[PDB]
Amino acid sequence: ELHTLRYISTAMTDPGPGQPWYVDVGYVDGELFTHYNSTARRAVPRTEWIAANTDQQYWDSETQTSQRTEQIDRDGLGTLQRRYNQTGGSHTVQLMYGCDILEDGTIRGYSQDAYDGRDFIAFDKDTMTFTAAVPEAVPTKRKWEEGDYAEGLKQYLEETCVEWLRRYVEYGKAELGRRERPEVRVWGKEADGILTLSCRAHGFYPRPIAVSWLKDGAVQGQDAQSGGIVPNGDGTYHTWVTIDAQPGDGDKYQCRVEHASLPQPGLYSW
Amino acid sequence: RRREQTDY
Amino acid sequence: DLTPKVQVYSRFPASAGTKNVLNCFAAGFHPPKISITLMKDGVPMEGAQYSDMSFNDDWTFQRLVHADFTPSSGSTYACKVEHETLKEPQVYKWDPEF
């Protein structure tokens, strides 16, 4: 994927305490760049490159359509509860849509909704129809399939969203093209007959990374447990991989970090 | 930019 | 119903007497209603900030909670998580050098 634009939204009956019931977030190439919630009632910048390249009219405009959507989701919770015979209790409406520009120039457009975790409805852009995942989505399918909504959504995903993505990506040219070298630490812990070696990578960008444990040079892809890639507050990422070994084979083991910032994979020992 | 939506 | 996967970690490799940020990350949970609190010696940590609600392609929710701090020896840092899938509040102890 060359570039991606994605907007997500969540409508909740149970946020809960002191929390906004409606939250809406936007992403350019994975990076969080904008959000809106029901408490603040304003669509705001969440990065410097978006704020520097958008005026006041842009945000007023984004705020309006986020407030309009909020009301839709407010009534939407009531509508779906009546269709399911609820309350019920606590319920959630989720939506994600956007653009994927692929490395071959292919444009991918998606828009799909979910109720209470499970798939509700999705837009088939090629047939210009909405696919109902559940029986309760059928009335919604009928409403959307009547007007010009299909064409409007088709145009947005194929043109509008694509054209704005092309713009956002040039605004964040420098911040998105960043290379951040991970800070790596190796720690070892002796416990009741087993030695657990830990390998932590701190503050790398971009997100994709390969961290694995080697024994004498050969990768131990079986015994090793990974924590996956998790985000830091500043926009960088974090990961950890641990390995169980017989003590003391610490001299035999090596952590191999493979990342875009490194001209060759980093090797680390204990 | 965020798109416009319609009632469920 | 889905149980949150939680891990607590620091922004930089931890060193006592040095500016750092403690992060707590829960993922893969439903419903979105969750309580996540960073704590120092049983008392909520100062200046905690959290990201607005986000979810993956599989609709599972996630949240990051982080706070600036300076690590101290003989002081315990942990992340306390409450969720409806959990029978009791779960406490995740942070290991400064692991």
Side-chain angles (χ1 to χ4, degrees):
Chain A
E1 309 181 320
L2 182 62
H3 304 304
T4 61
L5 180 52
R6 177 138 95 200
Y7 293 98
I8 59 162
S9 65
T10 302
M12 298 155 280
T13 50
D14 197 15
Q19 300 277 57
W21 71 272
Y22 179 82
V23 180
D24 152 48
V25 193
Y27 298 90
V28 171
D29 294 18
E31 189 171 52
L32 207 156
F33 82 107
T34 186
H35 96 273
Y36 171 99
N37 73 59
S38 59
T39 314
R41 294 270 295 167
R42 302 294 192 194
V44 290
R46 274 254 217 152
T47 189
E48 278 188 327
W49 55 260
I50 198 67
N53 292 291
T54 55
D55 61 347
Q56 197 56 60
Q57 291 212 64
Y58 179 93
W59 293 112
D60 294 2
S61 181
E62 284 281 80
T63 299
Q64 181 182 225
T65 62
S66 213
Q67 284 177 338
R68 290 194 199 273
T69 300
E70 199 189 332
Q71 189 57 232
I72 290 155
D73 274 27
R74 186 172 204 96
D75 296 321
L77 283 158
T79 316
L80 268 50
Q81 273 171 101
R82 279 189 286 271
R83 292 190 200 175
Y84 279 91
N85 293 301
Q86 295 168 332
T87 47
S90 82
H91 309 284
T92 320
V93 174
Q94 283 165 283
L95 167 71
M96 63 169 183
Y97 68 93
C99 293
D100 298 332
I101 300 171
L102 270 39
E103 63 177 24
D104 63 342
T106 308
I107 294 154
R108 211 164 75 201
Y110 57 97
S111 184
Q112 54 200 119
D113 310 62
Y115 183 68
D116 297 352
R118 200 80 72 95
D119 284 340
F120 194 72
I121 197 161
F123 179 56
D124 192 327
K125 205 221 306 169
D126 301 359
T127 57
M128 295 215 216
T129 44
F130 295 91
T131 319
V134 81
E136 286 83 357
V138 173
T140 299
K141 185 208 205 297
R142 300 297 174 190
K143 290 160 91 158
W144 293 351
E145 231 148 53
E146 278 171 354
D148 295 288
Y149 183 46
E151 190 191 348
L153 187 50
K154 170 93 171 291
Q155 183 194 277
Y156 171 82
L157 296 167
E158 288 189 346
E159 296 181 338
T160 316
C161 158
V162 180
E163 286 150 36
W164 278 106
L165 177 53
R166 294 178 206 265
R167 282 204 261 188
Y168 300 144
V169 145
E170 249 278 326
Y171 301 154
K173 200 179 174 72
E175 200 173 296
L176 298 164
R178 268 187 310 143
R179 296 284 178 261
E180 218 91 300
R181 262 151 55 249
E183 294 179 63
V184 184
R185 281 295 174 281
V186 183
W187 310 104
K189 196 157 75 182
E190 173 73 37
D192 50 46
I194 51 98
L195 172 68
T196 311
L197 287 159
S198 180
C199 191
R200 289 194 174 271
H202 299 254
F204 53 88
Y205 186 90
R207 200 187 176 275
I209 198 166
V211 179
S212 46
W213 272 105
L214 311 156
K215 198 180 183 291
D216 286 340
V219 55
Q220 300 297 119
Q222 177 57 47
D223 319 70
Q225 193 176 315
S226 173
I229 308 159
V230 288
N232 292 307
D234 62 350
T236 62
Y237 297 92
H238 179 93
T239 189
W240 68 262
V241 175
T242 54
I243 190 86
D244 284 325
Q246 281 179 305
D249 291 353
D251 309 349
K252 298 169 188 172
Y253 284 85
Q254 278 186 311
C255 187
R256 187 176 69 198
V257 176
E258 299 148 65
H259 188 79
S261 68
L262 308 166
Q264 47 194 308
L267 296 165
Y268 304 92
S269 297
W270 196 49
Chain B
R1 64 153 184 84
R2 305 164 219 257
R3 76 179 175 92
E4 213 81 56
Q5 286 173 226
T6 182
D7 296 293
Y8 287 87
Chain C
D1 258 18
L2 281 156
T3 316
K5 310 281 277 183
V6 186
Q7 45 193 98
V8 52
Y9 53 97
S10 58
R11 170 61 185 80
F12 302 102
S15 179
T18 321
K19 165 83 175 191
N20 214 328
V21 188
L22 190 62
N23 300 72
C24 189
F25 188 75
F29 61 89
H30 179 89
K33 191 191 193 173
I34 196 164
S35 166
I36 311 159
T37 325
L38 291 165
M39 301 215 295
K40 177 183 183 175
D41 299 311
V43 185
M45 272 181 63
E46 198 84 304
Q49 290 172 332
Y50 50 85
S51 67
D52 271 26
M53 266 294 157
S54 185
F55 57 87
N56 283 13
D57 302 41
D58 65 337
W59 309 109
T60 53
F61 289 91
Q62 61 182 46
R63 199 196 280 277
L64 173 72
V65 178
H66 65 274
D68 302 355
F69 83 123
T70 303
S72 296
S73 305
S75 196
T76 315
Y77 300 92
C79 183
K80 189 179 178 183
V81 178
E82 294 183 45
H83 190 83
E84 70 162 45
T85 60
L86 304 166
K87 289 168 77 72
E88 55 186 312
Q90 295 284 292
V91 180
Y92 293 86
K93 190 191 166 182
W94 175 65
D95 204 330
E97 285 139 35
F98 192 79

